[PDB]
């Protein structure tokens, strides 16, 4: 039961289901102490049974319990764990992650097979903790807290920050992801080339594997952090290492429309 | 009484409790029929149950009576002005002791919480809870800066004497987590209360001198 920024209160549907069960349980205790007739006691016991049902699994038996003033069924414990919006598929089998970006993709014909064009301003946010350390290593900032303030305001960022960033990303790779990820070649690791602009540059030869053309497609950027994550991405997931198709064994990065036409 | 926060069966059970009370208090000597007297208790129980169980955040009975009266007064003014009354109209209608500030406070108090599972948009894949940040647990940046500050202060207190550093770590609650008064600290070291205030003031002054020579601790103060 949290208070939103505006001062309003937001609560979950479980509190309403718990309150109904407690309100009915307490009333039954009062009626039992009053020596009420069996008809009254039976109705309260039947209601208490239904209150537990609604809390455990709302709508499984009879009409769903709804919040007064609305027709939306209350969310029960079973609804929390079940379905495409349940805990399993929504929060355990998949999650939202930090050190991740997104932007429109354009074609980079000058890139090597293992390179991608990462915008400088995306790279600054994605690699921020690494950059703060590098700024502190050099004379750019006195400490990490001062360095973090510099990046907060765009007009406070000096030109030496970009030189330090070029050092932070050296050797490192990033994962480019396009949805839907039909096969494992829908995620690939590239060595970013910091570029001016706001769109990611994608190598022409990896577009078939990603199933990505350039009529408005967008891609996600993920930064593996530790040495294992970087070693795995640079060895197993690198674009220049996955040249054949795992399904048929035939080349999957091969000449395409404009390249075939020229040759 | 349906549509006021309680379901039909909940209203009946609250009414039944009033009917039980009417049986005990009823007097057949007066020659009044039972429904004449039992109707008072049945309505009383049903109405009280609404005032006590109809809101997630329970509001006392007297405050519910004020809220209901305030809503009734506004509706009558609304039908007569041909528009929603302002807090001044409502305050004047309510009577003595009421001003626009109180009317606004009562309306703010009578606001029901909004469910965290309310869908937004045509698709049933987004809810209110998906847009509400958690602001209790510290963030990785907050936790890191707290450890950085503690790490630097530990080095700064290293320049201090063996006792002077301990006095500050006690007078500022850096050991037990809670501050120790001059007398409470003195018992630990068996020194007088006035003496500790001298070393602590002197030890604190030295820390100021070092910071000016390095300025390695001014960033953490914001």
């Amino acid at each position: 039961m949290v208070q939103v920024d505006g001062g309003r209160f937001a609560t979950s549907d479980l509190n309403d289901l718990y309150r109904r069960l407690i309100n009915r349980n307490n009333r039954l205790k009062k009626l039992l102490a009053q020596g009420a007739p069996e008809i009254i006691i039976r109705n309260e016991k039947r209601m208490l049974q239904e209150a537990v049902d609604a809390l455990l699994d709302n709508g499984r038996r009879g009409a769903p319990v709804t919040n007064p003033g609305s027709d939306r069924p209350l969310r029960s414990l079973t609804d929390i764990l079940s379905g495409k919006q349940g805990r399993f598929r929504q929060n355990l089998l998949g999650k939202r992650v930090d050190y991740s970006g997104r932007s429109v993709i354009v074609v980079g014909p000058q890139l090597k097979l293992h390179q991608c064009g990462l915008p400088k301003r995306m790279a600054l946010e994605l690699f921020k903790p690494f950059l703060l350390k590098k700024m502190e290593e050099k004379g750019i900032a006195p400490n990490v807290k001062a360095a973090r303030r510099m990046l907060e305001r765009q007009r406070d960022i000096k030109d030496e920050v970009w030189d330090a960033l070029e050092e932070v990303i050296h050797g490192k790779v990033v994962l480019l992801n396009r949805a839907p990820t039909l096969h494992r070649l829908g995620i690939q690791a590239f060595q970013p080339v910091l570029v001016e602009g706001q769109s990611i540059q994608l190598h022409p030869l990896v577009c078939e594997a990603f199933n990505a053309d350039f009529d408005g497609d967008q891609m996600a950027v993920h930064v593996p952090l530790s040495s294992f994550a970087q070693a795995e991405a640079r060895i197993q997931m690198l674009s220049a290492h996955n040249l054949l198709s795992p399904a048929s064994g035939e080349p999957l990065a091969k000449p395409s429309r404009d390249i075939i036409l020229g040759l | 009484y349906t549509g006021r926060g309680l379901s039909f069966l909940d209203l009946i059970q609250e009414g039944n409790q009033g009917l039980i009370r009417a049986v005990e208090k009823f007097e057949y000597k007066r020659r009044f029929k039972f429904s004449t007297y039992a109707t008072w208790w049945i309505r009383q129980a049903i109405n009280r149950a609404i005032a006590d169980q109809a809101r997630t955040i329970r509001i006392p009975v007297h405050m519910v009576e004020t809220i209901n009266k305030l809503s009734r007064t506004a509706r009558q003014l609304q039908q007569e002005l041909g528009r929603e009354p302002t807090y001044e109209e409502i305050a004047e209608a309510m009577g003595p002791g009421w001003d626009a500030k109180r009317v606004e406070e009562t309306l703010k108090i009578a606001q029901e919480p909004v469910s965290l599972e309310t869908p937004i948009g045509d698709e049933k894949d987004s809810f209110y809870g998906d847009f509400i940040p958690d602001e209790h647990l510290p963030s990785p940046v907050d936790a890191a800066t707290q450890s950085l500050l503690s790490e630097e202060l530990e080095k700064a207190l290293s320049k201090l004497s063996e006792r002077e550093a301990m006095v500050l770590k006690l007078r500022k609650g850096l050991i037990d987590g809670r501050e120790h008064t001059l007398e409470e600290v003195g018992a630990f070291f068996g020194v007088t209360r006035e003496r500790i205030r001298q070393i602590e003031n002197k030890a604190l002054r030295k820390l100021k001198y070092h910071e000016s020579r390095t300025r390695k601790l001014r960033d953490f103060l914001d």
Binding site: I39, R42, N43, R46, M47, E50 | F8, L9, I12
Partner: peptide
């Protein structure tokens, strides 16, 4: 009506 708690109660008080 078994599936309807209200109808079930009304039937009981009608006895």
């Amino acid at each position: 009506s078994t599936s309807d708690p209200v109808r079930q109660y009304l039937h009981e008080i009608g006895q």
